[model samples]
Target chain A: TKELQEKFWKALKSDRTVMLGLDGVEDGHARPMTAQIEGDSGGPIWFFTSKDNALIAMLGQGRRVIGAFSSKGHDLFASISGSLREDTDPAMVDRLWNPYVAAWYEGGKTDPNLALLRLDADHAQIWLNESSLLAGIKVLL
Target chain B: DTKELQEKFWKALKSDRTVMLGLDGVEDGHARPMTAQIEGDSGGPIWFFTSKDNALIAMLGQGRRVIGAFSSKGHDLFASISGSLREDTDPAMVDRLWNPYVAAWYEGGKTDPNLALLRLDADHAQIWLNESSLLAGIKVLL
Candidate 1:
């Protein structure tokens, strides 16, 4: 379980693209979001999005969320469950800020539309497809 | 332009067989990436070969609301589709859609007791085309 969990975070760090959605919302289809993670594992996944985003608008305070991940090479897949909340902590915003994130906002971090979402992952269902094995390894993290 | 975007969505789906699928009303219904079987008909239901024990398959005795999200490997096309999913385990259909990749899941092949076929009769979908060539992005609701 530990090994698989590490692999999951590793793959995510390499490709931060993940589809996130709320339960019983939008017909259960998730929209793609760029995830920002700090530390090696067991840390809150962050996203720089707009306050007007559908996923953001739906979150009153926090809600149950599901995140799907596919590795760039399609070698790993994961379904992550967690609580999603609006976390616009200036300290975190400063930590995760980047040029790409700034480009989306009109006046950089100070823009009113800029919103930070934090996903404190409860656990993850991971599958690793090794080249040697046709059947992949599935584990819960 | 809407027709062009719809065509692009169909083309991308045909090329990339995988789509994230989930039950609509079920809480904790985490969508799973499933390999779809397409018959090359643009206006037809999409099929998936799965095990009867799967949660999504078990909940589809009559029919259930479901959603499928698709994104092209090139990331040029994306769609969020709503549909009705039901078990349609026709033997002939299975025979026609069988392949080595599907075979990897079941050793008994077509006759496996666990083998199940699911059909998603898509009602409508919101298709988006993100191409640099197009000055304005296209989002077509079908």
Candidate 2:
């Protein structure tokens, strides 16, 4: 279990970008998202969204969601399913804050329009593509 | 209303070679990256090749619906597409779409029985392309 968790964080940092899907929303299409992994966030991943973002705002406590991540070069890959909650932890604002986070906020972290979603990854499956030749062989047999 | 978004989705996908797919209620959530073949137009269909046993193929029984998020190598393009997944059995269509890269996955070449087609017929989509500048990343939330 720890080994899998190791792979999980490594893949997340390696590919900070993730595609997420909500169980009953948007005809079930995924959206590209950049994750904010402030203060070693895992088991629960913290992401930033707009308060007015239609799709993400549709989620609430206990709503099912899914995400996928592919590390650069496609060597490490991870997919996770989880539930989501809207959170407003002031400490997280200070810890993970960056210039990009400020771009969406006219109030710059104090803006009420900034919505933070806390995603608790319930499960994940990883595929490590070791070598091109080996991956090809694995696909065949 | 969403017409411009769909057009950008097609154009962005056309410029990129990969898309990560999520389906099976997160039992198959990893968003594995696959080489995508965008067919005729943006809202029509997209295709990928995988072994018959691959999650992308097996998810069909789990459900016909899937969501794919894609980003180009550069930061210029990104999109999320919601669509239906089904088997494309037309060998001729496969023949038209095949290339040397797909050969790596199939030892039997065009005749590989394990080879399967995963088709995504898009129904809904959202796209962000031409980030304009590095500072524009935040605007994607809109």
Candidate 3:
């Protein structure tokens, strides 16, 4: 289990893409969001999204959330459960800023619609893709 | 031409045997990877072998709304299909779809309590056959 968890974190750190969804929100379908993280071990994953986004607009106080992940190579999968809320800490916003994120907002950090959402993952179910087992076996031989 | 496109989508799904499956009206919008089990031709229901404890399994009932996102193994074709989900009790169909891949998850074989068979009776879909990044806004009602 430790190995699986480590693999999931590593994959997320490398890819930094996850599908995020919130509970009890009307028409809250999971949508792909770029995940940002800090600290060595698993910590809160963050996203720079827009207030107009459905997940953000519907997020009132806070709500249960799920982040689904699949490695680009399809070798890892995870279903991470947590709660999400908006955090407008300038330090975090400045820390996570990058050219990629800037492309989404016209005014960059000054963009009024830009919002930083955080996911405090409680637990996750991680799995290695079945095809990876074959790869493992092949490597052993 | 649209029918032909839809048929291509099913054929790709059958060959790939993988789709991201999620439920509608549920808080957990994250869909998980599921192996697609095809029984008949293009116009038939798509089956999935899953665990009873899975979120998708828990949400199962009479016509529970569900969505499936599919991509061909080569990533050439893509589809977003919406459908109703229900548990199937047909032992014969289970027997037909049962295999090593499905058995690996259930220790007790077909009789395993954790085993759950879900049928996705797809009602509508939007399929894209090209590599274009943006959706062309085509909705096909099946």
Highest DockQ model number: 2
Models 1 onward score TM values of 0.83, 0.75, 0.70
Candidate 3 local lDDT, A7-26, one digit each (tens): 88888888776666554443
Q: Pick by TM-score: which candidate is best?
A: 1
Q: After superposition, how far is residue B14 of candidate 3 from its true place, in Å?
A: 3.9
CA displacement after TM-score superposition, residue A123 of candidate 3 (Å): 1.0
Runs off by more than 4 Å, candidate 1: A132-141, B24-27, B41-43, B74-76, B127-142
> lDDT tens string, model 3, B1-142?
9878988888888787777776654545556788888877666588888778776666676768765666564446666666788888578989988888788888899989888888888878766664437767888899
Per-residue lDDT of B139 in model 3: 84
Q: Deviation in angstroms for B116 in model 1?
A: 0.9
- Give the per-residue lDDT of model 2 (tens digit) for B16-105: 667777656434455767778865655467888888777556547634866787766554556777778887857987887888877877
Fnat, 2 decimals, each candidate: 0.30, 0.61, 0.18
Candidate 3 DockQ vs. native: 0.17
lDDT of each residue in A1-141, candidate 1, tens digit only: 888888888988777877776655666666777888877666699999888877776788898777877776667778788889889898999998988787898878898888899998888777676777477789898
